[PDB]
Symmetry: C2
Subunit: 125 residues, 2 copies
């Protein structure tokens, strides 16, 4: 595994993010955890690809060009902003807006989001 | 596992952070990953408990009251700031200062750091 990869157990729903990579295969519920590769699921890009906007002091990330649902069983569980050697994670909940604000000094950033149904998505400025 | 717990494989060195919890036990290299519980290792608190300094527009986190080494065989691998539903991670490298700045408008925060040898430490304001 490599730093910042996200892995899911499809049995029990554990989802983890790698902070230090290594060669071992991550396992949960007696099977290999699935690597949630970004932008690989068949789903509406308009609702899943993050849109990155500047704000005073940082960035606002919206999921997506069309606001994604935030329902009990279908919501954006978190949005991340990646820059340099930083990974900023904003967890979200049903009933909230599908967006996040990050205060950061960084000219180049990557935004990620994870949808509990449609998996892992990213964009960059 | 629960959100924001940190688990290490003691065989290959994978370290992961939980983004979504669940009931299965995380496994790597055919053994249960170790839960890296904060402030449990026998290590100098002066060099490991984060120091949280309020600054204009956020917090500066220093590891620790005495600066921790940042050597190839002994360094702080990351510092995090936790506030409500955020987890901001700053990765570090040998040769860098053992500190991080986070722009987080929150009165109450928890700072964490992970040392490659002495494990996982936290403090709160
Ligand atoms: Ca296998
Ligand atoms: Ca993070
Ligand atoms: Cl890596
Ligand atoms: Cl790594
Ligand atoms: Cl959708
Ligand atoms: Cl020490
Ligand atoms: Fe392992
Ligand atoms: Fe979705
Ligand atoms: Fe599992
Ligand atoms: Fe240490």
């Amino acid at each position: 595994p490599e730093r910042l990869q996200v892995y899911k157990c499809e049995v029990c729903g554990n989802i983890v993010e790698v902070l230090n990579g290594g060669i071992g295969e991550l396992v949960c519920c007696n099977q290999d955890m699935k690597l949630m590769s970004e932008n690989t699921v068949d789903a509406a890009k308009a609702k899943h690809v993050p849109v990155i906007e500047k704000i005073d002091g940082g960035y606002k990330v919206k999921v997506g060009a069309v606001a994604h649902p935030m329902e009990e069983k279908h919501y954006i569980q978190w949005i991340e902003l990646l820059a340099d050697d930083k990974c900023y994670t904003q967890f979200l909940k049903p009933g909230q807006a599908p967006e996040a604000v990050f205060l950061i000094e960084a000219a180049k950033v990557v935004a990620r989001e994870y949808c509990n149904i449609h998996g892992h998505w990213k964009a960059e400025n």
